[PDB]
Design a protein around this ligand. Structure first.
Ligand code: ADP
Ligand code: ADP
Ligand code: ADN
Ligand code: ADN
Lengths: 338, 327
């Protein structure tokens, strides 16, 4: 094995700015959700937006910058164009130390982008134009790479493009056949409605081993307001399934075993963007260096919470080095012994 | 008059990331300085650089956004390309409410970009590739706009590209011909060595009324370690000049007059990039709505301070708000 984690997901650059509640209703944007938009809507939304800040995103791409940051070894397959947006995206995931070799488009569509509006509550509302991401398919599976990677992890978000599901059946095959595990995030609670069924059967066929989701996503995957009930069904359909509970932290599920680890207490909720992504990043960093579900959920919340103190979805410095070093400096500020 | 401040400057997109000191010196990057680099040095540095975040920059660009955020009317001249970086630069400065109409390049060179390496002390070391910026010249001056703008502010950083200074001699001329005032920033201590003489002439000719500078730069301008000496000469070469002094604040100079104002005291110095630029924004916003020198200095320090507690060279927050909230 050469990689702990491989992620496959929509390669997306994030253009982010603050706005208020009325902005989102005035523009018919769904608060909290990922809104899918054509290129004309990306241009229109952009023009109505305040000055923004741009940062590499992509749900799966974040989770791989995550693992690399935590200390792990990671690799990523994404769809980007031969343009300035893609050249940045490329560099950003590489400078994490992730393996990124996927071939870029060469003209239109241009690199995918997402108009991310953060409200005062740290909630984030996304409006994503897929660009280059629709061209992602089976041709883009690096073969050797899926085989050398302990987990393979990929977005529900990948159902939207046309032929990403076929780059997926395929990496699920390659990876299982090499004694490896497959993982997914449910992405968003509307993705969940738009592919309830594709998602389930994709679990039941034991194509996907591990399932990450937030509470709404889980409630909605089994069309229900009963959360306990939903925890059972989710246990039946995969080996392993982690569920984010925002501030409550997490509840991992394995048959009737339910590891509830709680979440840090945060200074401010600045920008929620990137949380679930970094929860899973930490968790899998734990999981692929053999660690308890207990110490896994912990690595989860720890990583989530750091990224929520930030305009942006990705740690711009090694969490390995920072989290340790923070911890040392508090100790010595509190005049405590190590 | 229609605009309070017009700035003219190297239009640049900042690419920003952390590094340590050792990194700067393995790459022969002068710390705290602005380092010019060809396209090939850009690709190379970029690859050696950690994950970055990106934001509209440009010394004059920031200053113009600054004036708008505070509530003033601003405009900007600078050269971008018809590419994705140019499109962002364009959006950000327009979304501040700044007037920007300068026509982009179409093709090569591409939109300028500066790789800004921030060390732990929040000093910032910049490696800028001018790209589309060399294409800036007299043809890019909007005559009516310069005549309509109470102050016309421009970077000393514009003596690096070939024909920028010509656009400049033109705009100073249009401005004085309409009863307006021109200002400039000395930009970088090294920029100062590179043009020590042009700059002084710019002043003594009365082309530049007002001068903005930090401490190191004021000294370079007169090659002297005597700071008061440096201040005396500066009062002789221009109508008015403001010198920022980091944590000490600013001192402003007008003949024999010396208005010193302290900096706000800060919680965190995160990223020092943009400080000299927002200082001038605050100062010129106060200056162009008829405020005393003291109040100009306060507004300058307020805005410098807010931006230094932030990754990115332009404040995320509404400055008109922070100015009102501080009374
Ligand atoms: N309000 C909060 N306070 C502290 N940590 C939080 C908070 N919200 C989210 N997190 C962290 O990031 C993860 C994901 O948050 P969650 O609400 O489950 O939804 P999502 O996947 O939509 O971002 C958490 O499980 C946790 O570690
Ligand atoms: N350490 C600091 N604490 C509070 N304010 C500061 C600090 N450093 C700079 N400033 C603010 O930014 C302005 C620019 O400071 P200076 O270091 O002289 O700028 P430059 O970035 O042009 O070298 C100051 O006049 C001040 O208001
Ligand atoms: N349709 C999408 N597919 C994959 N990632 C997305 C999509 N829409 C938004 N994102 C990513 O979601 C992240 C956090 O959940 C962001 O950084 C952003 O890039
Ligand atoms: N050669 C240059 N001319 C004008 N502004 C620059 C130059 N290089 C970097 N900058 C900008 O200087 C700022 C603060 O001084 C940053 O936003 C950065 O983009």
């Amino acid at each position: 094995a050469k990689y702990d984690v491989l992620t496959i997901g929509n390669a997306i650059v994030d253009i982010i700015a603050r706005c208020d509640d009325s902005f989102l209703e005035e523009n018919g944007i769904i608060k909290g959700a990922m809104n899918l938009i054509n290129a004309d809507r990306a241009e229109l939304l952009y023009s109505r937006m305040g000055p923004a800040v741009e940062a590499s995103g992509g749900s799966a791409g974040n989770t791989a910058a995550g693992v690399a940051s935590l200390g792990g070894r990671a690799a990523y397959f994404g769809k980007v164009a031969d343009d300035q947006l893609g050249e940045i995206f490329t560099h950003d995931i590489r400078a994490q130390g992730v393996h990124f070799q996927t071939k870029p488009l060469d003209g239109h569509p241009p690199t995918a982008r997402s108009m991310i509006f953060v409200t005062e509550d740290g909630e984030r509302s996304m409006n994503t134009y897929l660009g280059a991401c629709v061209e992602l398919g089976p041709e883009d599976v690096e073969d050797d790479v899926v085989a050398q990677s302990k987990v393979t992890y990929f977005e529900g978000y990948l159902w939207d493009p046309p032929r990403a599901k076929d780059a997926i059946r395929e990496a699920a095959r390659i990876a299982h056949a090499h004694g490896r595990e497959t993982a997914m995030t449910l992405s968003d609670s509307f993705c969940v409605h738009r592919y309830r069924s594709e998602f389930l059967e994709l679990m039941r066929s034991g194509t996907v081993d591990i399932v990450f989701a937030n509470r709404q996503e889980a409630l909605a995957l089994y069309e229900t307001e009963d959360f306990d009930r939903a925890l059972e069904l989710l246990a039946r359909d995969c080996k392993l399934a982690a569920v984010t509970l925002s501030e409550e932290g997490s509840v991992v599920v394995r048959g009737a075993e339910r590891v509830r680890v709680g979440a840090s207490v945060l200074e401010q909720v600045v920008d929620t963007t990137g949380a679930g992504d970094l929860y899973a990043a930490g968790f899998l960093f734990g999981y692929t260096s053999g660690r308890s579900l207990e110490e896994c959920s912990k690595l989860g919340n720890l990583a989530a919470g750091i990224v929520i103190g930030q305009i942006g979805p990705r740690p711009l410095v090694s969490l390995a080095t920072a989290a340790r070093q923070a911890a040392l400096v508090a100790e010595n500020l509190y005049f405590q012994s190590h």
